[PDB]
Amino acid sequence: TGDRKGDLYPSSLQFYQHPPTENISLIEFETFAIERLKLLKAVENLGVSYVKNSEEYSKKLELELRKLKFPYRPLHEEISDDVYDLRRKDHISHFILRLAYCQSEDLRRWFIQQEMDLFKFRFGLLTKESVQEFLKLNDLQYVAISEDEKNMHKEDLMNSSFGLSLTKMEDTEFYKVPFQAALDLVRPRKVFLWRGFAFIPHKDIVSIVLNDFRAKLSKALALSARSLPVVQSDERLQPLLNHLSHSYIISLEQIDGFAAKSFPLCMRQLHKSLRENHHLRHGGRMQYGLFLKGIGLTLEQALQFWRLEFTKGKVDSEKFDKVYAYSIRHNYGKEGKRTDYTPYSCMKVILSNPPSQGDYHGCPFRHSDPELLKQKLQSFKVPSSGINQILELVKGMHYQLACQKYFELTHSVDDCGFSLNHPNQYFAESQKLLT
Amino acid sequence: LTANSMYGCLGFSYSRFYAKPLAALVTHQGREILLHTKEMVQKMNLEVIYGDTDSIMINTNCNNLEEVFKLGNRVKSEINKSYKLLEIDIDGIFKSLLLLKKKKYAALTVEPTGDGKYVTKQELKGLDIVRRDWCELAKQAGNYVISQILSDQPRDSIVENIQKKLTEIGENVTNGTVPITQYEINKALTKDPQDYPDKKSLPHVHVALWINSQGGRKVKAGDTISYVICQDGSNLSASQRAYAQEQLQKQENLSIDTQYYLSQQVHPVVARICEPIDGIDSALIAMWLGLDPSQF
RNA sequence: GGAUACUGC
DNA sequence: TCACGCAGTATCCTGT
Ligand code: SF4
Numbered sequence: 102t103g104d105r106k107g108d109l110y111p112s113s114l115q116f117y118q119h120p121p122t123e124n125i126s127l128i129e130f131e132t133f134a135i136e137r138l139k140l141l142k143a144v145e146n147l148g149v150s151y152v153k154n155s156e157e158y159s160k161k162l163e164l165e166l167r168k169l170k171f172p173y174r175p176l177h178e179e180i181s182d183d184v185y186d187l188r189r190k191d192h193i194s195h196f197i198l199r200l201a202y203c204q205s206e207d208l209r210r211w212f213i214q215q216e217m218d219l220f221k222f223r224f225g226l227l228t229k230e231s232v233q234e235f236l237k238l239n240d241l242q243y244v245a246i247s248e249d250e251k252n253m254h255k256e257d258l259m260n261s262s263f264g265l266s267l268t269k270m271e272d273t274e275f276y277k278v279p280f281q282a283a284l285d286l287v288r289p290r291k292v293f294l295w296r297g298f299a300f301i302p303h304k305d306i307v308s309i310v311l312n313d314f315r316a317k318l319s320k321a322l323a324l325s326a327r328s329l330p331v332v333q334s335d336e337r338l339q340p341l342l343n344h345l346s347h348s349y350i351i352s353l354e355q356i357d358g359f360a361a362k363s364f365p366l367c368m369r370q371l372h373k374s375l376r377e378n379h380h381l382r383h384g385g386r387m388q389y390g391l392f393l394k395g396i397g398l399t400l401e402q403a404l405q406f407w408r409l410e411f412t413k414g415k416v417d418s419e420k421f422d423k424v425y426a427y428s429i430r431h432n433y434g435k436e437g438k439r440t441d442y443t444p445y446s447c448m449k450v451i452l453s454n455p456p457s458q459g460d461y462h463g464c465p466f467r468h469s470d471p472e473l474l475k476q477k478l479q480s481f482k483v484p485s486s487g488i489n490q491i492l493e494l495v496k497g498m499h500y501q502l503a504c505q506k507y508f509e510l511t512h513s514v515d516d517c518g519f520s521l522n523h524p525n526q527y528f529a530e531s532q533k534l535l536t
Numbered sequence: 537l538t539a540n541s542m543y544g545c546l547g548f549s550y551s552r553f554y555a556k557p558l559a560a561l562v563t564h565q566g567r568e569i570l571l572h573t574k575e576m577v578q579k580m581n582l583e584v585i586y587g588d589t590d591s592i593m594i595n596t597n598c599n600n601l602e603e604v605f606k607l608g609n610r611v612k613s614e615i616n617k618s619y620k621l622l623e624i625d626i627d628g629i630f631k632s633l634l635l636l637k638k639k640k641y642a643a644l645t646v647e648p649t650g651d652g653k654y655v656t657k658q659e660l661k662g663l664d665i666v667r668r669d670w671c672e673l674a675k676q677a678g679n680y681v682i683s684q685i686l687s688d689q690p691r692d693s694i695v696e697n698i699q700k701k702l703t704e705i706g707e708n709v710t711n712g713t714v715p716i717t718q719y720e721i722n723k724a725l726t727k728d729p730q731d732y733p734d735k736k737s738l739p740h741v742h743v744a745l746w747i748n749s750q751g752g753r754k755v756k757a758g759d760t761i762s763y764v765i766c767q768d769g770s771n772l773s774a775s776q777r778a779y780a781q782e783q784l785q786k787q788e789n790l791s792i793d794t795q796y797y798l799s800q801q802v803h804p805v806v807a808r809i810c811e812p813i814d815g816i817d818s819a820l821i822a823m824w825l826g827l828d829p830s831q832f
Numbered sequence: 833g834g835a836u837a838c839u840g841c
Numbered sequence: 842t843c844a845c846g847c848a849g850t851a852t853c854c855t856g857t
Pocket residue numbers: 365366367368447450451463464465466500501504523524527
């Protein structure tokens with residue numbers, strides 16, 4: 102309580118009943134609005150991704166609350182100025198978002214849901230003492246029985262609560278609630294009723310609290326939607342509130358580019374066939390998948406690329422996940438023996454399965470007839486002298502030397518400077534030279 | 537069967553009466569017949585939704601059984617009018633149908649008793665619930681789901697019930713209350729145990745090998761083997777962790793791999809049974825079983 | 833690409 | 842010395 106504080110913010114949790122009356126700045130208005138929008142969007146995303154009782158949900162929500170500096174934990178110290186500030190934030194931001202989220206029923210529902218979620222989390226973080234404090238400050242009057250009355254009904258209480266020991270019971274304090282709120286407890290006869298009140302010990306209560314909260318909040322949103330014309334005239338706040346819900350708070354595409362320069366001729370042929378027909382026989386699938394694993398395409402990236410490429414081949418989308426997903430996972434050592442299979446070496450490619458009609462895998466220098474290789478080299482604008490030299494090398498059975506000559510000619514380097522013995526080595530050298 | 541074999545031998549490579557042409561012709565004619573029948577049904581402005589080499593399913597789009605029967609008769613006669621010895625008959629009236637995929641469906645066959653009354657009998661064709669390679673637990677679950685889907689209860693309630701049952705199953709697995717007999721998977725051997733080159737990858741074969749290593753009667757081609765998937769700390773794939781039930785009851789290091797049974801036996805089956813039903817999707821099912829709904 | 837199962841009609 | 846046909850769905854693996 103430094104300069105201009107008060108008892109306006111007793112507890113962390115609140116039902117947001119009394120609107121703020123202060124005069125704030127436009128900058129503060131915008132900052133609070135955006136911050137609470139971030140908080141609510143985080144709540145929604147975590148609710149979709151995780152189970153709200155999960156520990157991951159709690160950890161991530163605590164991290165977000167700490168990052169945006171919102172009240173989430175109690176403090177048995179006093180009302181420190183900083184704490185006051187945080188609470189003030191929460192109180193103002195909430196109402197600002199109300200103004201933002203009352204125009205359309207959809208929006209209203211969304212707001213309510215997020216708010217309820219947040220409230221539940223915060224309640225889940227309240228110590229029993231704090232919980233009672235809250236239940237008192239809002240006149241919820243859920244009991245707290247006196248010690249004398251507790252001794253008066255000691256035996257009844259002992260027989261009411263399941264698995265409660267004499268001394269342990271002496272160490273516990275109950276609450277008095279109207280039986281209309283403890284339906285789920287009274288119905289199976291697991292809480293004592295006396296004179297219309299149930300005596301409930303210190304999980305379900307949050308539910309009742311939330312019900313009350315939701316009622317109130319819905320009413321409030323209705324009223325806000327009824328008081329909209331007064332705000333639309335304030336241009337300063339119109340761009341924000343009218344559009345808050347739509348407020349912003351290696352790549353597959355470049356692969357084709359790589360195919361222009363870095364890809365060795367084998368991968369270039371495979372990629373050309375794939376983009377021509379959106380389908381590869383098994384050998385091509387294995388070779389190209391291993392190569393794209395080598396360049397660095399992550400499991401998610403490779404899955405996305407293969408899905409997008411194959412979907413155009415007039416096949417069911419589910420068929421891909423049914424069939425080719427396992428192969429893609431296995432190439433990355435995700436299933437089966439779970440081995441990080443290395444990319445094919447040039448020796449393997451040369452000595453691997455021999456390609457046949459309809460296939461495009463293998464080393465072109467070895468699996469392409471000299472006339473076809475000459476035509477392909479001419480197509481790539483290679484100088485006639487370079488094409489002749491490559492053909493001469495091919496006739497010498499040293500296909501790796503032919504690929505080295507290709508690299509030298511295409512990269513405008515007199516000497517390759519490396520012993521090409523892996524397609525990934527080819528791509529790495531090309532990337533080193535270019536980038 | 538005898539008659540069918542008298543046909544099939546015509547295309548049996550090692551038969552004394554190999555006449556592949558003839559058999560081909562037979563099949564061809566059959567195809568033609570089916571096509572024609574379908575065309576005729578469509579010319580009658582009905583709807584055809586399935587047919588397997590001699591049959592047609594027609595969506596009567598009616599609820600008056602008598603009228604349906606009338607239509608049956610009518611179309612029956614029409615078809616017969618084109619053939620001399622061939623005949624078509626009403627092979628069943630399904631009150632409800634759940635057509636999932638080619639040669640995989642379930643229905644409630646209607647057996648008439650008289651005076652317009654009729655009884656209903658559950659019939660399944662091709663579903664995993666009628667396959668021996670799935671754990672009995674899962675099968676039962678699926679059966680329950682089918683009984684819920686094919687009934688006349690309001691859809692919402694159906695869904696609710698399904699959820700309840702699935703959660704029950706989850707608990708029964710987590711507490712290990714389910715009888716061990718329900719965790720078994722049965723598979724037959726086409727060859728002898730030794731001929732398989734994947735003694736590790738193939739689970740049933742593995743179990744067979746173990747049995748042959750034990751001191752009892754050996755298992756040979758055609759003998760079904762029952763195995764369970766357990767935990768041993770090996771950190772290997774499920775396919776390599778198969779074990780004979782007795783072994784599980786004997787060794788003190790093996791425990792049933794609850795996760796696996798909840799993740800690859802119950803969930804798949806149920807999902808495939810719930811694919812065309814609105815309101816149930818894989819994710820939800822997984823959630824109801826206690827699995828993580830992230831990777832689903 | 834391959835291997836292992838078992839349903840149908 | 843043997844052994845019926847084909848159409849279709851589901852699961853799993855690819856190091857020396
Ligand atoms: S030598 Fe190696 S990198 Fe070059 S085309 Fe042949 S397989 Fe591909």
